[PDB]
Structure 1
Amino acid sequence: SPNMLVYRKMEDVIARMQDEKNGIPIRTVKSFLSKIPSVFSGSDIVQWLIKNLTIEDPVEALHLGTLMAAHGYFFPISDHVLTLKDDGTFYRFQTPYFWPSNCWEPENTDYAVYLCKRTMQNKARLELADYEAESLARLQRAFARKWEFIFMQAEAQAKVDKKRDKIERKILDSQERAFWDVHRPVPGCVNTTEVDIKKSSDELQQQIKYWQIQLDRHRLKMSKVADSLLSYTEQYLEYDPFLLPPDPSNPWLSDDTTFWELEASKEPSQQRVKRWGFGMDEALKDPVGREQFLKFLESEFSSENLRFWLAVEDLKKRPIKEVPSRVQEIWQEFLAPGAPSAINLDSKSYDKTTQNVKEPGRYTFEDAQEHIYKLMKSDSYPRFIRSSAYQELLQA
């Protein structure tokens, strides 16, 4: 179960927190009104975080502390809503029987028990806040039968704990107050219990063959990948609109629209034209690049292979209703010998084509597309980038 590991890590945290030799010291304050022992101030825990965790931002360490304290690992002695506030207020750890890691789950009758007990310990005031008084009103109206032993065991517990010493009753009641704060919190702050429903739950011959495919699994050195990754970063590094934007106009930040609108304009910018020059794949991604490359191929009387590859791609878009209607037709137009558009195949290519053409398939012309595609990538794109039209358009 996932969150179990999370709670385990934070358990590591608090275990290092109340360390014998290091740790925060749980002090005993003396006041003009009273003498309160076994507390400490939130500035202490803030300092402890910053020391032993090296959390550079005070705010960051404070937010870590915030959610920790909203998972019941320490609470403010005079408040319902768990929030760590860096100041002189008094805190306390929680008990190993009342962590939240212990799969606990209170229920409505037990909330009624704690309500009767708190309301009946003191009888000097309605020692409570308006939300908890509201909850008790509902519990009354709906629990008409079962009240009595609730009251019974409540005052029983009151005697069984008051019989022990006066500071004991105080600390135990403080703890077993806060632990019900965290498991039924004030209307505002988020519950920290819930979870998402998603987590709501020959033999050696194939073995040996896996070993052999790992052998023939061609790999390259990490330095090679390093160069590839750095270089693919660099070639658009000057295009990153987060780090160093080529144009600081940001429709988000600087309330402009012109950047995208220039992007909509079919006329390519000089960034655009320099960016075409990296790879014809990116070109074909560009509609503008498709148009200009196709123009050159036409004016050079060489506008067929691109026509084919566009044909393959535009075929790979329609549903299964038209796959046969196109495959036979595209064969008869390009891959049927005797048609004007003469795609050119070798032995195994045309063999594969002839065998598959009976059956229209989502991966029909893979090897032929590879063949013509390596052809175009090897020949066309180079001369295009080398071409006068490319140079004249990249100049301005």
Structure 2
Amino acid sequence: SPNMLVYRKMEDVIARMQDEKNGIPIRTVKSFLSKIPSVFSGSDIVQWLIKNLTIEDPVEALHLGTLMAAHGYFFPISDHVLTLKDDGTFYRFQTPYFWPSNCWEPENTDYAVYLCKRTMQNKARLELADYEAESLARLQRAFARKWEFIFMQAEAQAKVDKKRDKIERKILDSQERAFWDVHRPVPGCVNTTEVDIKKSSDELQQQIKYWQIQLDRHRLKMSKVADSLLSYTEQYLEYDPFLLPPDPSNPWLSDDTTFWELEASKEPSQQRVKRWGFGMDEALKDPVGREQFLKFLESEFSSENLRFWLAVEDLKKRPIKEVPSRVQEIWQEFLAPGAPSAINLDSKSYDKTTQNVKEPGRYTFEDAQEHIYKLMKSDSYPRFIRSSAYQELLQA
């Protein structure tokens, strides 16, 4: 179960927190009104975080502390809503029987028990806040039968704990107050219990063959990948609109629209034209690049292979209703010998084509597309980038 590991890590945290030799010291304050022992101030825990965790931002360490304290690992002695506030207020750890890691789950009758007990310990005031008084009103109206032993065991517990010493009753009642704060919190702050429903739950011959495919699994050195990754970063590094953008026009930040609108304009910017020059794949991604490359191929009387590859791609878009209607037709137009558009195949290519053409398939012309595609990538794109039209358009 996932969150179990999370709670385990934070358990590591608090275990290092109340360390014998290091740790925060749980002090005993003396006041003009009273003498309160076994507390400490939130500035202490803030300092402890910053020391032993090296959390550079005070705010960041404070937010870590915030959610920790909203998972019941320490609470403010005079408040319902768990929030760590860096100041002189008094805190306390929680008990190993009342962590939240212990799969606990209170229920409505037990909330009634704690309500009767708190309301009946003191009888000097309605020692409570308006939300908890509201909850008790509902519990009354709906629990008409079962009240009595609730009251019974409540005052029984009151005697069984008051019989022990006066500071004991105080600390135990403080703890077993806060632990019900965290498991039924004030209307505002988020519950920290819930979870998402998603987590709501020959033999050696194939073995040996896996070993052999790992052998023939061609790999390259990490330095090679390093160069590839750095270089693919660099070639658009000057295009990153987060890090260093030359067009400062930011429709988000600087309330402009012109950047995208220039992007909509079919006329390519000089960035655009320099960016075409990296790879014809990116070109074909560009509609503008498709148009200009196709123009050159036409004016050079060489506008077929691109026509084919566009044909393959535009075929790979329609549903299964038209796959046969196109495959036979595209064969008869390009891959049927005797048609004007003469795609050119070798032995195994045309063999594969002839065998598959009976059956229209989502991966029909894979090897032929590879063949013509390596052809175009090897020949066309180079001369295009080398071409006068490319140079004249990249100049301005």
Please indicate the TM-score interval, normalised by the length of the shorter structure: over 0.9
What secondary structure is seen at the aligned counterpart in 2 of 1:29? Answer: strand
Deviations along 1:130-155, one digit per CA (max 9) or x if unpaired, are 00000000000000000000000000
Residues 26-80 of structure 1 deviation map (CA, whole Å, 9 limit, x = unaligned): 0000000000000000000000000000000000000000000000000000000
Deviation of 1:343 (Å): 0.0
Matched with 2:171 is 171
The CA deviation string for residues 93-125 of structure 1, in whole angstroms up to 9 with x for no partner, is: 000000000000000000000000000000000
Q: Does 1:218 align with 2:218?
A: yes
Q: TM-score with structure 2 length normalisation? A: 1.00
Q: Report the counterpart of residue 157 of structure 1 in structure 2.
A: 157
State the Cα distance separating 1:189 from its structure 2 match: 0.0
Shift of 1:288: 0.0
How much identity, in percent, do the aligned residues show?
A: 100
Per-residue CA deviation, residues 244-264 of structure 1 (Å, 9 max, x unaligned), is: 012111000000000000000
Counterpart of 1:116?
116
- 2:80 aligned residue: 80
Q: In the TM superposition, what is the alpha-carbon distance from 1:363 to its structure 2 partner?
A: 0.0
Unpaired stretches in structure 1, ≥5 consecutive residues:
none
State the SS of the aligned residue for 2:226.
Answer: helix
Cα shift readout 1:209-260 (whole Å, capped 9, x = no counterpart): 0000000000000000000000000000000000001211100000000000
Q: CA deviation at 1:270?
A: 0.0
What SS class does the counterpart of residue 82 from structure 1 fall into? coil
Structure 1 residue 349 corresponds to structure 2 residue 365: no
In the aligned structure 1, how far is the partner of 2:126 from the partner of 2:248? 62
What is the SS of the residue equivalent to 1:38? strand
Give the whole-Å Cα distance in 2 for the aligned partners of 1:250 and 1:170. Answer: 60
Instruction: Report the CA distance between 1:292 and its aligned residue.
Output: 0.0
RMSD of aligned Cα (Å): 0.1
- Per-residue displacement from partner, 1:350-373 (whole Å, max 9, x unpaired)? 000000000000000000000000
Counterparts of 1:94 and 1:283, CA distance in 2: 63
1:387 aligns with 2:387: yes
Q: d(CA) in 1 for partners of 2:39 and 2:117?
A: 25
1: CA distance, partners of 2:85 / 2:242 = 34
Q: Aligned-pair distance for 1:181? A: 0.0
Distance 1:291 1:249 in 2: 27
Deviation at 1:268, TM superposition (A): 0.0
SS at 2:36's partner residue? strand
> Runs of 4+ in structure 1 displaced over 6 angstroms?
none
Q: Distance in 2 between matches of 1:248 and 1:388?
A: 31
> SS of the residue aligned with 2:245?
coil
Please, what TM-score do these two structures have when normalized by structure 1?
1.00
SS of equivalent to 1:212: helix
Q: What does residue 30 of structure 2 align with?
A: 30
* Partner SS for 2:154: helix
DSSP-derived class of the 1:272 partner:
helix
Q: CA deviation at 1:82?
A: 0.0
In structure 2, distance between residues paired with 1:249 and 1:170: 63
Please report how far the alpha carbon of residue 81 of structure 1 lies from its aligned counterpart in structure 2 after TM superposition: 0.0
Q: Distance in 2 between matches of 1:350 and 1:290?
A: 27
- Give distance in 1, aligned partners of 2:250 and 2:99: 49
1:308 & 1:390 partners in 2: Cα distance? 23
What SS does the aligned partner of 1:13 have?
Answer: helix
1: CA distance, partners of 2:248 / 2:100: 49
3-state SS in 2 of match to 1:361: coil
Matches within 5 A, 1:267-282: 267-282=267-282
1:207 corresponds in structure 2 to 207
Deviations 1:125-179 (A, max 9, x none): 0000000000000000000000000000000000000000000000000000000
Could you say what secondary structure the match of 2:218 adopts? coil
SS in structure 1 opposite 2:228?
A: helix
Any stretches of 5+ residues in structure 2 without a counterpart? none
- Residue 265 of structure 1, CA deviation: 0.0
